[PDB]
Task: structure prediction
Amino acid sequence: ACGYSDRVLQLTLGNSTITTQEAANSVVAYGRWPEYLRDSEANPVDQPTEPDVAACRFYTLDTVSWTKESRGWWWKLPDALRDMGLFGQNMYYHYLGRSGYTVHVQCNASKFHQGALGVFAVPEMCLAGDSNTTTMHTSYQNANPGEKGGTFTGTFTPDNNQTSPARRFCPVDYLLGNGTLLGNAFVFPHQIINLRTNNCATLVLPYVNSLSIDSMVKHNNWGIAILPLAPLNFASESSPEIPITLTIAPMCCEFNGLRNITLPRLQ
Amino acid sequence: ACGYSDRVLQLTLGNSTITTQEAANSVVAYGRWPEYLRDSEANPVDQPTEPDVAACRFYTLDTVSWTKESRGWWWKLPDALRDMGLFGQNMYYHYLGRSGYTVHVQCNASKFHQGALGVFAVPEMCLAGDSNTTTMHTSYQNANPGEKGGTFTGTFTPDNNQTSPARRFCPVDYLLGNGTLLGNAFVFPHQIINLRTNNCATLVLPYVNSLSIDSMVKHNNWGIAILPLAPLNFASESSPEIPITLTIAPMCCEFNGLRNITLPRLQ
Amino acid sequence: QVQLQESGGGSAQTGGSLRLSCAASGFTFSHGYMAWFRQAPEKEREWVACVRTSGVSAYYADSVLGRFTISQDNAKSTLYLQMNNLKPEDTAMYYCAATSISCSSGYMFWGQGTQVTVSS
Amino acid sequence: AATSRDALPNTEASGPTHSKEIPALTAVETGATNPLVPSDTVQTRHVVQHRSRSESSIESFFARGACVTIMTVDNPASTTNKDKLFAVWKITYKDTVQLRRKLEFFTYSRFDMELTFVVTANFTETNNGHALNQVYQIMYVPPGAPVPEKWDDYTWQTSSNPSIFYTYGTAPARISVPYVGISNAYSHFYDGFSKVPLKDQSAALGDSLYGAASLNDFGILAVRVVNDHNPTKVTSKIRVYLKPKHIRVWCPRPPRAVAYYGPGVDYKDGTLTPLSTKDLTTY
Amino acid sequence: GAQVSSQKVGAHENSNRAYGGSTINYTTINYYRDSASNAASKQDFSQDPSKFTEPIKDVLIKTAPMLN
Amino acid sequence: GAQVSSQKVGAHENSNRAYGGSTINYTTINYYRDSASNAASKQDFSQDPSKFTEPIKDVLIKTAPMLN
Ligand SMILES: CCCCCCCCCCCCCCCC(=O)O
Result:
């Protein structure tokens, strides 16, 4: 009648607005919408700081590229947004913090392009090491690659330099980077951007953890993994390229225990 | 009966608590308590960010010293708190900002010490230049001396280097640093710490300006000037010294127009 | 009738120097600034340099740094623009924008301007 | 409900006292002024107070017109070398001393503004020539509007500007201007700068004045002799008188002690001495 | 729509059958649409200076010790 | 046959016993027979700009897709 569609979506958070004309509806992770801490589940005694508009807005992470060679890409939340306006500021200023997200992945092309990208949301997305000698050895500096994030690899290559280890994640694509067959990755809330159909993936994520509120600096709640289910193909070309852009918006964020700022050793 | 006194005061803001046993009551500037912007006087259309506990807490500025030689001391608000936790962070992140304050000046001694310090609050505390050639020539870098603040001088000494001016304030003490006789400084809300009596000065200040909300980076609302009405004297000594400590707490702070952070040229 | 009238010409060879002047009248309320602006042959009007009211405190544009000198003579109520090391990028029109200012942008009085040409 | 012309509180008859109450003792550390009246300290009779504060009301204190500026223009002979003098004055109360200091008694104000124009002319050159009664246009050029460059250029058409053609000899000219401020109060003192000196910018690009808001705050007035060139030179002086009506003010500030120097708060040396010599024990 | 207001009589003329006595009033009628144009009323309020005299949080009672 | 109209008060004088408060009015009486001669009232209406903004035949609903 009036023309309301599932493909046409307009999301708004604070002073930012995301639109789209080729969506595939939207995903509310585990059906729960992100929310503020209820007195019933409260834990720290102090008055929590809720930045709201100050932090609850979409932040665009630098754009990555997609080619036939691409194995995959990954990020961590809140990690990924560690240096995004006030959200980061507030994050670094408090001992505790809980936040939900509205993850929107953008990757458009032509009706002449073909492929599929599975944007997966994994709470506690633990990734595997690169050493056949030392388990759980990835260093913090490699565990949290910020807004630039990381990638998946097509082959597991052990780290042999035991004089100075590389201490990073070697997340095998087919193993979803955690010793399990990718095909089962659908148990996690997800959407698959299939070029011929849509152009974006929106995954609203509530705060999920073992605790009501937790140290954000130390621990990542969610994980955003994007791997090409179908490889990129365009025309009769040998080198096609299309970009992927991630915009994430923290929601219902609250922080407790205000203190001096933490300057982490990221490098 | 229960022992409630004017000298004994316990102020609390957020996660900070100020006590005192030798106060002289407290001053609410122009009788108005600091407050949030009412829809009647609203101006910017966006949802304002109210940091509350995040910014509404006491922040201690580095302690200055008081000796018989001291002419005076001065600061600017919000300037003075430009680098105080989240309040500063938020300050730098927004185009507009309005805030009130709870200024508490601390300076104790012995019943054997003598002198008086007049902590004055001047809204729009404009100070005078140092050049007999160029009016209104003080550079921003000298106008905003942050938490370290400035001082008053006992004599006006013109700046003669016209090859490269010093471009600072030369605020003559008796002229209250603005061409008017100090003795009239009482028209501004104030308290005088007179050693034999009290030990602190508390001046709650509401947001005062020509606009409902204004650019904090560019403009200072209040001014905190402290000048010794009675010089410091202790025993039969030639060099007495006692410290003065300023702790200010922003109140009912609100900020609008969120954007990228401003990195001002302070030096 | 704050009459701003430029002078100084503009027809030097590449590398020389010219003296751009500006006669001022009316009521220039000293306090503020006094400056110079160029429009260029085919570009946007650009700020050259600004000098303080009576104060010899000034600044220069990145492009012109040290190669241009702007002073004043408030006794003669004039401002001067000595320009050494003229170049093919300096070829342009120059304007004495000296009024109000307070900075390096605001104005209520300009001049008619004069053209400069650094040929070679 | 207590108006300006109200009789002041009466003096109550109070007798001798010997009690634990202390009007006489206070502590000016509290910042607060001890609020006493004669009766509190000495024996008094009953007094029906007659005096009122009537004249001291904010409105009344500014109820006078005040000379803000003296604009000079002239009408020279056609053959002359110099151009016909037409003045342009930046509208501000800070060109003169008197009114300014009065306005400086506070931090902010709002007032509908009344301007009066007193014109006065005369000849200059020794000659017995004649000039017919001269007219004068006073054109208000708001910020940004085209400022006249000539005495006879297009700008004087005033299709949108508010002008006043004054004929010489008639009563002084007067126009009303409301509170035209961009803020919610006019600002007498502005502790801040118009620009912010950023770090990714050159010092020059981020520099501005101390105490200034907008260089052009209200605009300029332009006054010119309307009548054309006359063989005998006639100079004219237009005096502007401002009376701030419907005035409100906020936050009192100590009155200026030393002479003004520039539009700022700054003080010149050689004027830093206001109070004279008086011996402590000499009445 | 005339505005009739009363005057505070100062020097009383030897009358109470025209002047001096029976309350003296004055008429005023605005001539323009703009509020700015009006004549200054002068019928203004006064107020408590305590907002300047006693800027204290706890009420000032003159009869008792200031600091208790 | 006077015309009494109200004014939109801007700068409020410290009064509510003459000015500032109790609605300020102004009187007007025409002096000529010709309508042309009258003073410009200034009490004019405003209107919907849609006759220019939305010159469309089928109503514009901001919340839905323009072309359906
Ligand atoms: C025909 C004249 C029309 C308009 C005249 C506009 C001039 C307004 C001058 C108002 C002076 C008020 C000064 C307060 C300073 C401030 O706002 O900060």
Q: What stands out?
A: The longest strand of chain C covers residues 17-23. Chains C and E do not touch (no CB pair under 8 Å). Strands of chain C lie at 5-7, 17-23, 33-38, 46-52, 58-60, 68-73, 78-84, 92-97, 114-116. The CA atoms of residues 59 and 65 of chain C lie 9 Å apart.
